[PDB]
Design a protein around this ligand. Sequence first.
Ligand code: A1CGQ
Ligand code: A1CGP
Length: 330
Amino acid sequence: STGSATTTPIDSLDDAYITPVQIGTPAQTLNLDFDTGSSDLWVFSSETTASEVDGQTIYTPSKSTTAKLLSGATWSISYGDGSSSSGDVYTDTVSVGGLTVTGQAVESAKKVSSSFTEDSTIDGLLGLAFSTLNTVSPTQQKTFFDNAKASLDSPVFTADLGYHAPGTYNFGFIDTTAYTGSITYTAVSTKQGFWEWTSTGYAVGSGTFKSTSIDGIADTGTTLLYLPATVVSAYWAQVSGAKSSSSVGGYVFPCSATLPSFTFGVGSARIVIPGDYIDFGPISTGSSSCFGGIQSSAGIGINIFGDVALKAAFVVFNGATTPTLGFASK
Ligand SMILES: OC[C@@H]1CNC[C@H]1c1ccsc1
Ligand SMILES: OC[C@H]1CNC[C@@H]1c1ccsc1
């Protein structure tokens, strides 16, 4: 089997991407944030505290003939940005882009933090990291990808995020029309539960490539590119008037600037992030200070290849017995 679904930016900045997902019988379609940095499929629901729902579409398990309470199971998750959610668990039929999994754990939110309530465009998350990070207790649950894997034509999914445009998540096949040149594959460590890999270095604009190992995670559910302070300082030093603002919480730059590109290494290959991808717009409406898309990972304890980096590539998440990542230009 295969599945293919379009993923759409939630706003004009590509702050996140939503993908329609069918849950239950008859289908209830929710728009979920596909997150290769976490391993829970959780939804706004009929169980979510009413004051914490503001415009989201909810899953109502009592309206699904295939929903079953997973008795005794609870979940609770805290994300890198400080947001959180928790609740109980159902099993149900979940389909993505024509690919169906029966008995998928659907984690129903009883509580969500203010950042989820305040974002009406995201109805929940669909985690695509390794199932070792799944938070369900006392019986850990499998991701949608892990449940689908054995049925797929090839044990892979791919992320093709758009810049200010829709893109695609594919399951079980590699669309050879969706990228240019060849896919370069690179080793993955699953020791922390992430799609963790080592970039071979970077360049700023037309500058010379610096060969240096940068361990980090491929994370569709993080907006920005978070890299070591040395690398980030080298990038923003090429932008007149850029500075790190403690008051704003990262690097800002004059909105009048033209940003340089950023290149990252994948083995001997190179992925170029155009400068425009690194502009996240005014810090507040009408401001001439703009937020940078490349930020320091200092204090996060990990480097994150988030959407800024991944949207510049066609990315293969290869779930073979020894997982690997692939990157192609497009
Ligand atoms: O902020 C949410 C991030 C999206 N993926 C999971 C999460 C993260 C990244 C590194 S540790 C936790
Ligand atoms: O802050 C909670 C959500 C509101 N908008 C995006 C954000 C999120 C956190 C992890 S994935 C998406």
